[PDB]
C-alpha cells in the first residue's frame, strides 16, 4: 500500500448516481442498431394420435369402412 491504498487504486471521489433524479429515464449506451446480413389466450395441449377423430360421440369406428377405399 505505497502512497496509500486509496491513491494507488483510483476509487472514485463522488457518487454520480446521487446527481440524477429519475433512474428510470436513463440509457447507458444510446441505441440499438440491427443490420440484416378482448379475452386472454387459453392454454393449449399437444394433440393425440391414437384415435382418428372426435367429430361425433357415441360412434363405432370399427363399423366404418377404411378411408383409402372410399372412392
Amino acid at each position: 500500500q505505497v502512497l496509500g491504498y486509496k491513491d494507488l487504486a483510483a476509487i472514485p471521489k463522488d457518487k454520480a448516481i446521487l446527481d440524477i433524479e429519475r433512474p428510470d429515464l436513463m440509457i447507458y449506451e444510446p441505441h440499438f442498431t440491427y443490420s440484416l446480413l378482448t379475452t386472454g389466450t387459453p392454454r393449449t395441449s399437444l394433440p393425440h394420435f391414437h384415435h382418428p377423430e372426435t367429430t361425433r360421440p357415441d360412434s363405432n369406428i370399427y363399423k366404418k369402412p377404411p378411408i383409402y377405399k372410399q372412392r
Binding site: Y5, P12, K13, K15, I17, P23, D24, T44
Partner: protein, 374 residues
C-alpha cells in the same frame, strides 16, 4: 466524506456484473462460465493455461468445454465460483477485497446452505471486513424509484415475482418459477432442427444464444402471427454463422419466447408469467390490489424481447376486472436494474448499521446471515 465505497457484485446465472457503490454504471460485465481445454495439445514452449474464465473463454470457444457454475440460481460447483470471484476482484476491478465491504444478490427461495456457504467463502478466503446478502427484486424496486409495486424479475436461471406495499413485503405472496432464458435456449436448439440446422455442443449453444438475442420477438396475437407466417414469407431473417454459413429461421422467431407464456410447449404444467403475476397479485389483500395493478415493473434480461410489454399488458387486462387500470412500467434499462438499486442501497447512511461485521461472524459462525439478512 468517508468514501471507501462498498463493491456491488451481481452474481446471476447468465452474466456477472461488478462495480463501485454510488456509481450509475457497473464497471465490469462478463459472462459467468469456466472453460477447460478438451483436445490434446502438442506445442512445446506454448504457455499452458489450465482454465479460462470470462470473455477470453468466450473468444476461444473452439477448444473448450464451457461450464456454468450457477444453475437455476443454485451454485452447483464452488471452486469455479471462487475462480470467478477471484478474476472479478483482481483482474476486472484491480482492487483489494480486504479494504471494502461487498453486497451480493440472490433469488428469493433458495436453499439456506447456498447463502451460508456464500457468507463463509466471502469471509474466510477473501477476508472482507463486512458483507451483505439481498434479494434481487427488492433492489429492482429500489432502482425503479417507487416504494409500492410488484416486481417480476426474470434472469437466466429463475423468474420470481414479489409484491411490496409501502416498504412492507408480503412473503406469502412471493412466487418462484423455474423458467428462464436457458430453457428458451434449449427449446430454440430443439426447434431449429426442423429446418435442418443442427447444434449440439457448448460453442454451438452460445451461437444459438446469440441467435436468440439478435432475432426474437413476442407476438401480440399468436394464432394470427402463425397464420401470417404460414401464408407468406414476409417475416424471415437471415443470420450469419461464424464459419460463413447463412441460416434462415423465419417462423421460429416468435415461437421461442411464446414458451414463456405457454409452458406446455416444454412439458411443464405450470402457468405462464402473466398468470403467475396475476396469482401473486390476488394472493395479497383486497385494498392493496388497486395500487399493485398500476405499478407492475419488469426486470431482467429475459424481459428484453421486443413487444413483451404490450403482450403482458393485454394478458393482465384480460385477466383483471375491467374497471381497474393496468400499467406495465418497463424501463429501457431493466437489464442492469438489479445492480443499480443495489448501489443505491449501499449509498444510504442508515445501511451502515446493516453490515455483517467480522466480529459478529467470528462470534456466531456462518449462521448469522439468516438473522441478519431479510
Amino acid at each position: 466524506d468517508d468514501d471507501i465505497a462498498a463493491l456491488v457484485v451481481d452474481n446471476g446465472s447468465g452474466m456477472c456484473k461488478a462495480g463501485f457503490a454510488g456509481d450509475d454504471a457497473p464497471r465490469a460485465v462478463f459472462p459467468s462460465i469456466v472453460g477447460r481445454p478438451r483436445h490434446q495439445g502438442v506445442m512445446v514452449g506454448m504457455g499452458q493455461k489450465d482454465s479460462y474464465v470470462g470473455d477470453e473463454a468466450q473468444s476461444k470457444r473452439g477448444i473448450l468445454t464451457l461450464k456454468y457454475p450457477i444453475e437455476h440460481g443454485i451454485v452447483t460447483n464452488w471452486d469455479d465460483m471462487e475462480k470467478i470471484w477471484h478474476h472479478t476482484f483482481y483482474n476486472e476491478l484491480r482492487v483489494a477485497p480486504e479494504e471494502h465491504p461487498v453486497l451480493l444478490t440472490e433469488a428469493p427461495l433458495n436453499p439456506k446452505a447456498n447463502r451460508e456457504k456464500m457468507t463463509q467463502i466471502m469471509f474466510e478466503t477473501f477476508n472482507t471486513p463486512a458483507m451483505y446478502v439481498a434479494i434481487q427484486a427488492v433492489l429492482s424496486l429500489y432502482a425503479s424509484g417507487r416504494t409500492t409495486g410488484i416486481v417480476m424479475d426474470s434472469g437466466d436461471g429463475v423468474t420470481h415475482t414479489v409484491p411490496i406495499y409501502e416498504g412492507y413485503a408480503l412473503p406469502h405472496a412471493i412466487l418462484r418459477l423455474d423458467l428462464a432464458g436457458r430453457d428458451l435456449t434449449d427449446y430454440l436448439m430443439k426447434i431449429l432442427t426442423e429446418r435442418g440446422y443442427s447444434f449440439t455442443t457448448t460453442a454451438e449453444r452460445e451461437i444459438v444464444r446469440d441467435i436468440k438475442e439478435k432475432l426474437c420477438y413476442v407476438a401480440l396475437d399468436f394464432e394470427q402471427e402463425m397464420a401470417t407466417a404460414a401464408s407468406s414469407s414476409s417475416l424471415e431473417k437471415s443470420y450469419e454463422l461464424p464459419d460463413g454459413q447463412v441460416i434462415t429461421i423465419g417462423n421460429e422467431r416468435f415461437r421461442c419466447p411464446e414458451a414463456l407464456f405457454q409452458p406446455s410447449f416444454l412439458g411443464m404444467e405450470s402457468c405462464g408469467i402473466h398468470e403467475t403475476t396475476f396469482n401473486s397479485i390476488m394472493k395479497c389483500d383486497v385494498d392493496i390490489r388497486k395500487d399493485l395493478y398500476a405499478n407492475t415493473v419488469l426486470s431482467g434480461g429475459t424481459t428484453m424481447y421486443p413487444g413483451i410489454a404490450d403482450r403482458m399488458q393485454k394478458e393482465i387486462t384480460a385477466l383483471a376486472p375491467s374497471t381497474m387500470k393496468i400499467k406495465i412500467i418497463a424501463p429501457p434499462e431493466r437489464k442492469y436494474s438489479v445492480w443499480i438499486g443495489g448501489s443505491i442501497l449501499a449509498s444510504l447512511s442508515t445501511f451502515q448499521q446493516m453490515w455483517i461485521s467480522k466480529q459478529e461472524y467470528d462470534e456466531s459462525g456462518p449462521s448469522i446471515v439468516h438473522r441478519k439478512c431479510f
